Enzyme design. Sequence first.
Site, PDB file in Angstrom:
ATOM      1  CG  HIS A   1      42.664  75.191  38.807  1.00 25.00           C
ATOM      2  ND1 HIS A   1      43.751  75.776  38.187  1.00 25.00           N
ATOM      3  CD2 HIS A   1      41.563  75.786  38.285  1.00 25.00           C
ATOM      4  CE1 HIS A   1      43.325  76.683  37.324  1.00 25.00           C
ATOM      5  NE2 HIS A   1      42.003  76.709  37.360  1.00 25.00           N
ATOM      6  CG  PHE A   2      42.657  67.648  40.015  1.00 24.28           C
ATOM      7  CD1 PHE A   2      41.466  68.242  40.405  1.00 24.28           C
ATOM      8  CD2 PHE A   2      42.592  66.506  39.212  1.00 24.28           C
ATOM      9  CE1 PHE A   2      40.234  67.714  40.007  1.00 24.28           C
ATOM     10  CE2 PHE A   2      41.370  65.967  38.821  1.00 24.28           C
ATOM     11  CZ  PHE A   2      40.188  66.571  39.210  1.00 24.28           C
ATOM     12  NE  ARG A   3      43.998  74.882  44.011  1.00 28.92           N
ATOM     13  CZ  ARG A   3      43.778  75.975  43.289  1.00 28.92           C
ATOM     14  NH1 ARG A   3      44.536  76.284  42.244  1.00 28.92           N
ATOM     15  NH2 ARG A   3      42.781  76.785  43.631  1.00 28.92           N
TER      16      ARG A   3
ATOM     17  CG  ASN B   1      46.823  77.577  37.983  1.00 25.99           C
ATOM     18  OD1 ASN B   1      46.399  76.504  37.548  1.00 25.99           O
ATOM     19  ND2 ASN B   1      46.110  78.355  38.792  1.00 25.99           N
TER      20      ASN B   1
ATOM     21  CE  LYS C   1      43.703  79.217  31.502  1.00 28.58           C
ATOM     22  NZ  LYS C   1      43.609  78.590  32.858  1.00 28.58           N
TER      23      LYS C   1
ATOM     24  CG  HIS D   1      42.193  83.588  33.618  1.00 30.47           C
ATOM     25  ND1 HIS D   1      41.636  82.926  34.697  1.00 30.47           N
ATOM     26  CD2 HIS D   1      42.135  84.910  33.920  1.00 30.47           C
ATOM     27  CE1 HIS D   1      41.226  83.809  35.593  1.00 30.47           C
ATOM     28  NE2 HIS D   1      41.517  85.019  35.147  1.00 30.47           N
TER      29      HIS D   1
ATOM     30  CG  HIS E   1      36.911  81.321  33.582  1.00 37.31           C
ATOM     31  ND1 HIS E   1      37.447  82.481  33.063  1.00 37.31           N
ATOM     32  CD2 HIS E   1      37.940  80.654  34.156  1.00 37.31           C
ATOM     33  CE1 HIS E   1      38.741  82.521  33.323  1.00 37.31           C
ATOM     34  NE2 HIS E   1      39.069  81.424  33.984  1.00 37.31           N
TER      35      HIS E   1
ATOM     36  CG  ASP F   1      38.095  78.070  37.209  1.00 34.32           C
ATOM     37  OD1 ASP F   1      39.190  77.464  37.230  1.00 34.32           O
ATOM     38  OD2 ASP F   1      38.014  79.302  37.324  1.00 34.32           O
TER      39      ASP F   1
ATOM     40  CG  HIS G   1      41.813  78.223  47.489  1.00 31.20           C
ATOM     41  ND1 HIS G   1      43.148  78.426  47.212  1.00 31.20           N
ATOM     42  CD2 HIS G   1      41.126  78.792  46.467  1.00 31.20           C
ATOM     43  CE1 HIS G   1      43.265  79.055  46.055  1.00 31.20           C
ATOM     44  NE2 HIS G   1      42.052  79.294  45.585  1.00 31.20           N
TER      45      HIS G   1
HETATM   46 ZN   LIG Z   1      40.915  80.972  34.794  1.00 35.85          ZN
HETATM   47 ZN   LIG Z   2      41.014  78.002  36.123  1.00 31.67          ZN
END
Ligand SMILES: [Zn+2]
Ligand SMILES: [Zn+2]
Length: 423
Positions: A58-60, A89, A137, A168, A227, A302, A306
């Site tokens: 997740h590179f935001r 996301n 996803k 997920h 995961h 994963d 933050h």
């Molecule tokens: Zn996930």
């Molecule tokens: Zn994830």
Amino acid sequence: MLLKNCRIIKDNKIIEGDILIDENGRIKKIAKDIKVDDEIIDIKNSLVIPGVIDAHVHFRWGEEKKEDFLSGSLAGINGGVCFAIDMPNNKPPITTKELFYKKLEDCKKDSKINVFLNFGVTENNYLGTVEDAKAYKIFMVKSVGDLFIEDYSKLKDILNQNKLFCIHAEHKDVINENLKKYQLNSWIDHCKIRDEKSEVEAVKEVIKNLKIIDRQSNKKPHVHFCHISTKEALYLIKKVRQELKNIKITVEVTPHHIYLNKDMAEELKGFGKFNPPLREKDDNIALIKGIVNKDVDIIASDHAPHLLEDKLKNVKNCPSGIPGIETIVPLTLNLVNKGLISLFDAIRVLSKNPAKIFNINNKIEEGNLANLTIIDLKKEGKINAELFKSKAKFSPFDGWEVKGFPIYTVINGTLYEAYGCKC
Ligand SMILES: [Zn+2]
Ligand SMILES: [Zn+2]
Ligand SMILES: [Zn+2]
Ligand SMILES: [Zn+2]
Ligand SMILES: [Zn+2]
Ligand SMILES: [Zn+2]
Ligand SMILES: [Zn+2]
Ligand SMILES: [Zn+2]
Ligand SMILES: [Zn+2]
Ligand SMILES: [Zn+2]
Ligand SMILES: [Zn+2]
């Protein structure tokens, strides 16, 4: 450029040789004692493996104070990671073709490693195809926006496609039930609310629908479970793989679900809070055995950065997720040195299986772009989050002494120093 004195993982064996990289970044020759007039770097018999792929980061995008494409890819280089697959996301979530290509352009501008993007599946967009997406996803629980399948009755229709789906898998209804039963007072309560049954029931929900598709449909989806953290979900996936004829299922696990367990929850605080949460030691063991038995296909981080400020809040306010792209390779190699998995197991779950599953050519073969992870298998050293290149300079593994580090990362022929070449 000539890399001399390599021990190369090519096929099933370790060969000694030199690697000559032409100035387009392609491997020009692999041979012992190559003698050419070129720049020469002595690898000193370090191991050269096909470039590591972290299939889950997740590179935001949209939240660049947490991480961006530059800091994320510098973190990847530091961790020995040549390829990363970034989740949708974001703020806003990647649910339209135009948002996908607007994020792809920002990615191309500043990413220093090979980054691919996944597409976000909603109840509204699920028949659409995005040609450059690596996978689609599915979140079974709330993430951001409408990136969340709230109506599980639509799962059969969503999955009934010739697509690679990542899932997920936590069950929204089990979590809601538990939220009426427990209060979030301390860190262990997170583990009780998103309990092992919430994962197992989500996996069952998906499997139930795959069985229908396998027999009633001509579509052949590939389903990748992100995961997986519980021994029961791994068992169910092992079982159903014996029953399905047309549908392939792959399994990924994370370093934190291998190493950490809920007896550590109160000591880890925010640094142990992630989704799915900490499980039991018995689940740690099952996942390691699952790698050895080839039930677990890949390890992915994963990587979920933050702000440190938010991760220091109490359990109610603390976001879920830890950074992990800079620790995934050392923590996996550490398992090799502790005798829990073999060196070839490590290669399989970091490099060879992710390459097969997501159609990424990282092979060390003449003519291919050079994407290499160079490791010192026996280097002992401490993980030190101050040396992270991620914006998230913290980790539950901070201060751990492990054995095995990447020392160089080669991205399309360009040589970089990795974490271990300063350790
Ligand atoms: Zn996930
Ligand atoms: Zn994830
Ligand atoms: Zn060169
Ligand atoms: Zn010359
Ligand atoms: Zn930046
Ligand atoms: Zn497939
Ligand atoms: Zn069955
Ligand atoms: Zn358990
Ligand atoms: Zn804050
Ligand atoms: Zn605050
Ligand atoms: Zn020691």
